[PDB]
Amino acid sequence: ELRVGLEESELWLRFKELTNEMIVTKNGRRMFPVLKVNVSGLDPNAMYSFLLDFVAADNHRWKYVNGEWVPGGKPEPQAPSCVYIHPDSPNFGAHWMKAPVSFSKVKLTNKLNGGGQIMLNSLHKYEPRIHIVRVGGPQRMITSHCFPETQFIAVTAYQNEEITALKIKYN
Ligand SMILES: CC(C)n1cnc(S(N)(=O)=O)c1
Ligand SMILES: CC(C)n1cnc(S(N)(=O)=O)c1
């Protein structure tokens, strides 16, 4: 069976228990922590691409009011995020299973830009999601996996200083 697991869940859970925040910039900012995924049960000889996207967890705008994150009362439909292709893609199952698949080069932006960057609505809450796409074979197949532990609010600067301190402590 195709098993997908989050590497460093212990560390993600420290961020999540504080409400995690990720910076977005016009040029794009890399994530900390980095999403690293443990994958087993691929065909070592089959061909796969690893895709990353961000699902809007709710339809609301969030604001840091008196030391606490609180959703707006005016929900709107959230357009789905664009997909980031892991740069090792396409690659053999063996490649993907020999070390954690690390999305260290994805950049989160708040502006429609050239290419590569993922465009996120600031003050929206996001749940990272991967797609494992079997390619080149006759039978195309997709397996998707969400990572609740990795939820965050896109922010142009850190609201909760406890997040700022954790980010520095573990980088
Ligand atoms: C606003 C943000 C979440 N977004 C960026 N691109 C999309 S799209 N056209 O649905 O791929 C949505
Ligand atoms: C640009 C606009 C959406 N915004 C206002 N404040 C933030 S912040 N620093 O992320 O809380 C973003």
CATH of the domain at 15: 2.60.40.820
Q: How far apart are CA 10 and CA 39, in angstroms?
A: 18
Total number of residues shown for the chain = 171
Is there an atom of ligand 1 within 6 Å of 38 CB? Answer: no
Closest to 55 (Cα-Cα) out of 133, 171, 154: 154
Q: Are 37 and 5 in contact (CB under 8 A)?
A: yes
Q: How far apart are CA 160 and CA 61, in angstroms?
A: 17
The pairs formed by 67-70 with CB atoms below 8 angstroms and a separation of 24 or more are 67/160, 69/19, 69/153, 69/159, 69/160
Give every CB contact of residue 17 below 8 A, 6+ residues apart in sequence: none
Burial 82-97 (b: 16+ CB within 10 A, else e): eebebeebebebebbb
Q: Are 57 and 151 in contact (CB under 8 A)?
A: yes
How many domains would you assign to the chain? 1
Supply the DSSP symbol for 76.
-
Q: How far apart are CA 61 and CA 124, in angstroms?
A: 5
Is there an atom of ligand 1 within 6 Å of 79 CB? Answer: yes
Question: Amino acid identity of 107?
Answer: K
Is the preceding omega at residue 138 within 30 degrees of 0, hence cis? Answer: no
* Ligand with smallest separation from the Cα of 121: 1
Q: How far apart are CA 87 and CA 49, in angstroms?
A: 9
Domain enclosing residue 92, as ranges = 1-171
Measured from the Cα of 155, ligand 2's closest atom is: 10
Question: Amino acid identity of 132?
Answer: I
Is the torsion defined by CA of 164, 166, 169, 171 positive or negative? negative
Question: Amino acid identity of 66?
Answer: N
Give the alpha-carbon dihedral of 10, 1, 147, 60, to 10 degrees.
-160
Ligand 2 pocket by Cβ (under 6 Å): 122-123, 155-157, 159
Q: Are 85 and 51 in contact (CB under 8 A)?
A: yes
Q: What is the largest CA-CA distance in the chain?
A: 56
Write the CA distances from 112 to 116, 117, 152, integer angstroms. 11, 9, 20
Q: Bridge-partner residues for 50, per DSSP?
A: 132
Closest to 69 (Cα-Cα) out of 160, 147, 148: 160
